[PDB]
Structure 1
Amino acid sequence: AAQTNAPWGLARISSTSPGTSTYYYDESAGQGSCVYVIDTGIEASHPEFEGRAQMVKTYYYSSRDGNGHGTHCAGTVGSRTYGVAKKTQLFGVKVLDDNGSGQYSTIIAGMDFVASDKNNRNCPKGVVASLSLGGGYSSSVNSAAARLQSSGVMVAVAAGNNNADARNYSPASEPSVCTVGASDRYDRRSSFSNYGSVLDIFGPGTDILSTWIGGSTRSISGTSMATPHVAGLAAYLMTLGKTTAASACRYIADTANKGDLSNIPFGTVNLLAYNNYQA
């Protein structure tokens, strides 16, 4: 399948070179996989989700996304126009308030919830969790992310936007999950992207067009935007049977475009997510 005039990030993950505008992908498109988006919520009624999104848990008064961030991330995972895995099932877990903030105890609870809730869902091709959030180092937050991964969920987390070593942020610094940095359309490390030896992979994160609340769209930047590209790619590859939740991060790194990025500091991987599609 091919999506013409796609957002640059989708085109980038199906090409060996920058500057293309077509997203090439297998028509299976993540069908039978499930992605939990642990964030500010999802506007499930947005037409771009085609009924494939639902809120399953909130830690606040409402389950609605009053911010936009979670809806944007969910759109990059699996919306029709802006998503990597256009047929995956999306589940929203609202651990962040509508200002985008949240206590670590609530974020931990949300991760433990996903590890249990997945046993109630029909996700024959596997389960992914996308965490476009983070703060200062916390061993308890890292442990919660490691638990979620150990339970059989592919966990993808944002490296952070401090132009610093991600070893000082959580859950970015947990080695057993998939820690995602950001690049821009010219194959530079995004100027805000954290770096360091704990990064596993880069994905598109500057000027990413996706869904927004009120049935709208908008373009924003962040490692929060790169993470759902990798989460969606994992769901896509699990549906194709190429990998499992336990090894998807390693498989993505092994099959990545290598050496293409600039402004990568010594000691950080130079690996860009790639779907290796061949018509």
Structure 2
Amino acid sequence: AQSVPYGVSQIKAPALHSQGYCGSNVKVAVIDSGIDSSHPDLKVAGGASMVPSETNPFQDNNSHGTHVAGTVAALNNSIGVLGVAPCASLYAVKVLGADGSGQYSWIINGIEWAIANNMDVINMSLGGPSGSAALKAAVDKAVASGVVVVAAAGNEGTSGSSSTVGYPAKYPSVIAVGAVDSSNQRASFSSVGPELDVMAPGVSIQSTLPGNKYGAYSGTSMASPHVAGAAALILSKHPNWTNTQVRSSLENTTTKLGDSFYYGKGLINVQAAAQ
């Protein structure tokens, strides 16, 4: 039987599904460790590998990319779980190796790939403590080209009064996503700062794993795909909205939580955001 992970319901995705909005024809790129295309609960449309020693983007030796991808778009059927945008066209852009590490050049190449291939939405469940002119240039170009760019804020918790948001989330053009639990409380690991935009479920998130498995992961990496997926639903309802409109709608219709330094605008609500 199919289970709906708490997080999907928490963001109010199912209300849209009921309406016939499931992200059809929206191209979402998961820029991560690849996606196991053999998983029965996933449909991968395409992709690319930027990792020189791992040329198949459809082999995920890490497991994270498959897990993020399931949050975005696990199929609606009689097995496994359910994605936020179960009809989205899913792309594996492999930029991390089996060890879950990657060079910046690989990440940037993958963003460039996404722009060139007309992705509507980019999900980056990755982060580093430092940026670069090239990393900023790529995200900025994607946004100027009409792409919704979503990133995990980072898992650095608090640091006195400083921003612990990593890059690329830290850049203004990117939506930065922090993590809450099922009670709407901020996860202790969730990065903080003025650059935090929105919150999404990121604790004990059930999703797909390689080899026809399912399991729970925690992190802002798990929170981000809920927003990427939410962007895909909105785009399925309002195909002519610009990335700017999608972003503003998500940020403006949140359920407000605590201070913006810790929760940004609050918890997304796709039902409200979809109008």
Smaller-chain TM-score range?
A: 0.7 to 0.9
SS of the residue corresponding to residue 122 of structure 2 reads strand
- Deviations along 1:39-89, one digit per CA (max 9) or x if unpaired, are 00001121101x344333342323211110000001100112231001000
Instruction: Write out the 4+ residue segments of structure 1 that deviate beyond 6 Å after TM superposition.
Output: none
Give 1:272's match in structure 2, choosing from 267, 270, 275: 267
Letter in 2 for 1:216: K
Is 1:25 the equivalent of 2:16? yes
Is 1:130 the equivalent of 2:123? yes
Once residues 223 and 187 of structure 1 are traced to their aligned partners in structure 2, the CA distance between those partners, rounded to angstroms, is 14
Provide structure 1 residue ranges, at least 5 long, that are not aligned to the other structure.
16-22, 119-125
Letter in 2 for 1:190: A
SS of the residue corresponding to residue 30 of structure 1 reads coil
Name the one with the larger strand percent: 1
Once residues 195 and 143 of structure 1 are traced to their aligned partners in structure 2, the CA distance between those partners, rounded to angstroms, is 24
Is 1:117 the equivalent of 2:110? no
Distance 1:166 1:57, change over 3 A: farther
- Deviations along 1:88-127, one digit per CA (max 9) or x if unpaired, are 0001110000111011111111111111122xxxxxxx71
1:214 is matched with 211
SS of the residue corresponding to residue 129 of structure 1 reads strand
TM-score of the superposed pair, with normalisation by structure 1: 0.86
- Mapping for residues 1-279 of structure 1, pairs under 5 Å: 6-14=4-12, 23-26=14-17, 27-49=20-42, 51-60=43-52, 61-63=54-56, 64-80=59-75, 81-118=81-118, 127-140=120-133, 141-164=135-158, 165-166=162-163, 169-241=166-238, 243-259=241-257, 264=259, 266=261, 269-276=264-271
TM-score of the superposed pair, with normalisation by structure 2: 0.87
Contact residue 158 and residue 172 of structure 1 kept, 8 A = yes
SS of the residue corresponding to residue 228 of structure 1 reads helix
Mean CA deviation greater in 233-242 or 84-93 = 233-242
Once residues 214 and 107 of structure 2 are traced to their aligned partners in structure 1, the CA distance between those partners, rounded to angstroms, is 26
Provide structure 2 residue ranges, at least 5 long, that are not aligned to the other structure.
76-80
Contact residue 32 and residue 65 of structure 2 kept, 8 A = yes
Aligned-pair CA distance for 1:267? 7.0
* Identity rate, percent: 37
